[PDB]
Design a protein around this motif. Structure first.
Motif, PDB file in Angstrom:
ATOM      1  N   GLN A 161       0.806  -1.180   0.000  1.00 58.67           N
ATOM      2  CA  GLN A 161       0.000   0.000   0.000  1.00 58.67           C
ATOM      3  C   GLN A 161       0.874   1.279   0.000  1.00 58.67           C
ATOM      4  OE1 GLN A 161      -3.419   0.683   2.590  1.00 58.67           O
ATOM      5  NE2 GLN A 161      -4.079   2.355   1.188  1.00 58.67           N
ATOM      6  N   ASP A 162       1.978   1.296   0.722  1.00 57.08           N
ATOM      7  CA  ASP A 162       2.864   2.465   0.725  1.00 57.08           C
ATOM      8  C   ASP A 162       3.444   2.725  -0.676  1.00 57.08           C
ATOM      9  OD1 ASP A 162       4.019   4.599   2.461  1.00 57.08           O
ATOM     10  OD2 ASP A 162       5.918   3.579   2.124  1.00 57.08           O
ATOM     11  N   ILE A 163       3.761   1.651  -1.425  1.00 59.73           N
ATOM     12  CA  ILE A 163       4.234   1.809  -2.782  1.00 59.73           C
ATOM     13  C   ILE A 163       3.160   2.402  -3.647  1.00 59.73           C
ATOM     14  CG2 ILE A 163       4.977   0.541  -4.835  1.00 59.73           C
ATOM     15  CD1 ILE A 163       7.035   0.785  -2.606  1.00 59.73           C
ATOM     16  N   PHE A 164       1.983   1.822  -3.588  1.00 55.73           N
ATOM     17  CA  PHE A 164       0.829   2.414  -4.250  1.00 55.73           C
ATOM     18  C   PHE A 164       0.641   3.922  -3.960  1.00 55.73           C
ATOM     19  CE2 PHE A 164      -3.640   3.628  -4.247  1.00 55.73           C
ATOM     20  CZ  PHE A 164      -3.865   3.580  -5.599  1.00 55.73           C
ATOM     21  N   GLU A 165       0.532   4.267  -2.689  1.00 55.29           N
ATOM     22  CA  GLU A 165       0.228   5.624  -2.300  1.00 55.29           C
ATOM     23  C   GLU A 165       1.278   6.662  -2.726  1.00 55.29           C
ATOM     24  OE1 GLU A 165      -2.673   6.631  -1.321  1.00 55.29           O
ATOM     25  OE2 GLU A 165      -3.565   4.723  -0.840  1.00 55.29           O
ATOM     26  N   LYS A 166       2.544   6.343  -2.545  1.00 57.36           N
ATOM     27  CA  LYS A 166       3.617   7.220  -3.024  1.00 57.36           C
ATOM     28  C   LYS A 166       3.578   7.439  -4.498  1.00 57.36           C
ATOM     29  CE  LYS A 166       7.173   5.844   0.354  1.00 57.36           C
ATOM     30  NZ  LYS A 166       7.746   7.079   0.951  1.00 57.36           N
ATOM     31  N   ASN A 167       3.364   6.357  -5.249  1.00 55.09           N
ATOM     32  CA  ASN A 167       3.315   6.484  -6.704  1.00 55.09           C
ATOM     33  C   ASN A 167       2.046   7.244  -7.160  1.00 55.09           C
ATOM     34  OD1 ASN A 167       5.606   5.117  -8.369  1.00 55.09           O
ATOM     35  ND2 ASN A 167       5.316   3.808  -6.613  1.00 55.09           N
ATOM     36  N   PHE A 168       0.945   7.050  -6.405  1.00 52.70           N
ATOM     37  CA  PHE A 168      -0.277   7.763  -6.691  1.00 52.70           C
ATOM     38  C   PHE A 168      -0.016   9.260  -6.542  1.00 52.70           C
ATOM     39  CE2 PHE A 168      -4.096   9.831  -4.977  1.00 52.70           C
ATOM     40  CZ  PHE A 168      -4.917   9.759  -6.117  1.00 52.70           C
ATOM     41  N   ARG A 169       0.534   9.661  -5.389  1.00 55.44           N
ATOM     42  CA  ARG A 169       0.903  11.062  -5.179  1.00 55.44           C
ATOM     43  C   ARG A 169       1.828  11.679  -6.268  1.00 55.44           C
ATOM     44  NH1 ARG A 169       1.052   9.061   0.208  1.00 55.44           N
ATOM     45  NH2 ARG A 169       3.321   9.236   0.183  1.00 55.44           N
ATOM     46  N   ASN A 170       2.842  10.908  -6.687  1.00 55.35           N
ATOM     47  CA  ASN A 170       3.769  11.328  -7.726  1.00 55.35           C
ATOM     48  C   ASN A 170       3.077  11.463  -9.080  1.00 55.35           C
ATOM     49  OD1 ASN A 170       6.006  10.085  -9.902  1.00 55.35           O
ATOM     50  ND2 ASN A 170       6.731  11.801  -8.703  1.00 55.35           N
ATOM     51  N   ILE A 171       2.350  10.442  -9.485  1.00 51.23           N
ATOM     52  CA  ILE A 171       1.835  10.385 -10.836  1.00 51.23           C
ATOM     53  C   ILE A 171       0.740  11.394 -11.050  1.00 51.23           C
ATOM     54  CG2 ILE A 171       0.572   8.867 -12.443  1.00 51.23           C
ATOM     55  CD1 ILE A 171       2.326   6.523 -11.252  1.00 51.23           C
ATOM     56  N   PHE A 172      -0.078  11.594 -10.030  1.00 53.38           N
ATOM     57  CA  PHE A 172      -1.173  12.502 -10.183  1.00 53.38           C
ATOM     58  C   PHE A 172      -0.855  13.848  -9.550  1.00 53.38           C
ATOM     59  CE2 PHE A 172      -3.297   8.537 -11.017  1.00 53.38           C
ATOM     60  CZ  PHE A 172      -4.146   8.878 -12.036  1.00 53.38           C
ATOM     61  N   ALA A 173       0.402  14.044  -9.117  1.00 56.98           N
ATOM     62  CA  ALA A 173       0.875  15.344  -8.666  1.00 56.98           C
ATOM     63  C   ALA A 173      -0.007  15.899  -7.530  1.00 56.98           C
ATOM     64  CB  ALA A 173       0.931  16.307  -9.869  1.00 56.98           C
ATOM     65  N   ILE A 174      -0.167  15.103  -6.498  1.00 60.50           N
ATOM     66  CA  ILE A 174      -1.022  15.466  -5.393  1.00 60.50           C
ATOM     67  C   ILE A 174      -0.227  16.502  -4.606  1.00 60.50           C
ATOM     68  CG2 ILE A 174      -2.044  14.731  -3.216  1.00 60.50           C
ATOM     69  CD1 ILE A 174      -3.532  13.662  -5.629  1.00 60.50           C
ATOM     70  N   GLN A 175      -0.899  17.533  -4.116  1.00 60.28           N
ATOM     71  CA  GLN A 175      -0.229  18.624  -3.353  1.00 60.28           C
ATOM     72  C   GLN A 175       0.503  18.033  -2.171  1.00 60.28           C
ATOM     73  OE1 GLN A 175       0.453  22.062  -3.722  1.00 60.28           O
ATOM     74  NE2 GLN A 175       1.584  21.657  -1.855  1.00 60.28           N
ATOM     75  N   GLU A 176       1.797  18.299  -2.054  1.00 65.18           N
ATOM     76  CA  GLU A 176       2.520  17.879  -0.853  1.00 65.18           C
ATOM     77  C   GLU A 176       1.968  18.512   0.420  1.00 65.18           C
ATOM     78  OE1 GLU A 176       6.050  15.969  -0.648  1.00 65.18           O
ATOM     79  OE2 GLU A 176       4.681  14.888  -1.916  1.00 65.18           O
ATOM     80  N   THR A 177       1.891  17.676   1.472  1.00 65.88           N
ATOM     81  CA  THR A 177       1.494  18.138   2.831  1.00 65.88           C
ATOM     82  C   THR A 177       2.324  17.474   3.931  1.00 65.88           C
ATOM     83  OG1 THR A 177      -0.222  16.412   3.030  1.00 65.88           O
ATOM     84  CG2 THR A 177      -0.921  18.544   2.187  1.00 65.88           C
ATOM     85  N   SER A 178       2.302  18.083   5.120  1.00 67.18           N
ATOM     86  CA  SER A 178       2.700  17.414   6.379  1.00 67.18           C
ATOM     87  C   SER A 178       1.449  16.790   6.932  1.00 67.18           C
ATOM     88  CB  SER A 178       3.271  18.394   7.413  1.00 67.18           C
ATOM     89  OG  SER A 178       2.582  19.641   7.371  1.00 67.18           O
TER      90      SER A 178
END
Ligand SMILES: [Zn+2]
Ligand SMILES: [Zn+2]
Ligand SMILES: [Zn+2]
Length: 178
Positions: A161-178
């Motif tokens: 799931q962590d691999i999924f989520e990181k790649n999801f954030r990268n590929i779809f350019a999700i706004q970085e947050t804390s």
């Protein structure tokens, strides 16, 4: 070009990308490597092209907006790539094929899900929005966590799931947050 498959890291019958040095088995690449096409560019090149044609596509997005997008060609490709990135991790072998559930003290999920099923669903254009794909991917890991309870095998679900989520954030350019 590379002499091993980019996804599974094995030699065999490989197809070479013409615009980068990656290579793929036919059914390791998503979509499956196309019959003719000379030159052929792999999914990594096609995704890079989208980014280059629209640099602003890399500015931050809200997940809620991303999930509601219709699965037009570019979102279809991005989901295919994200699926491919999960298959690139060797621990994806646990989630690839259809699971079964017979463990003392646990009950199987109501809606089983696995990576090959998502692969077919994408291939058959069954998802109308990004949300459909993302919900099925997340379901895979949630079912796992719930079934394996306190067994340490639950951690495989967390890791993939962590691999999924990181790649999801990268590929779809999700706004970085804390
Ligand atoms: Zn392969
Ligand atoms: Zn390439
Ligand atoms: Zn532009």
């Amino acid at each position: 070009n590379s002499n091993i498959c980019e996804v599974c890291n094995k030699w065999g019958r490989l197809f070479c990308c013409d615009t980068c040095p990656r290579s793929f088995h036919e059914h390791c690449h998503i979509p499956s490597v196309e019959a003719n096409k000379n030159p052929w560019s792999c999914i990594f090149c096609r995704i890079k092209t989208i980014q280059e044609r629209c640099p602003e596509s890399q500015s931050g997005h809200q997940e809620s907006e991303v999930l509601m997008r219709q699965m037009l060609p570019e979102e279809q490709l991005k989901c295919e790539f994200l699926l491919l990135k999960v298959y690139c991790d060797s621990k994806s072998c646990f989630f690839a094929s259809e699971p079964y559930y017979n463990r003392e003290g646990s009950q199987g999920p109501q809606k089983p899900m696995w990576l090959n099923k998502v692969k077919t669903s994408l291939n058959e254009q069954m998802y109308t929005r990004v949300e459909g794909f993302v919900q099925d991917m997340r379901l895979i890991f949630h079912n796992h966590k719930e079934f394996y309870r306190e067994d340490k095998f639950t951690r495989l679900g967390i890791q993939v799931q962590d691999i999924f989520e990181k790649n999801f954030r990268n590929i779809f350019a999700i706004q970085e947050t804390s």
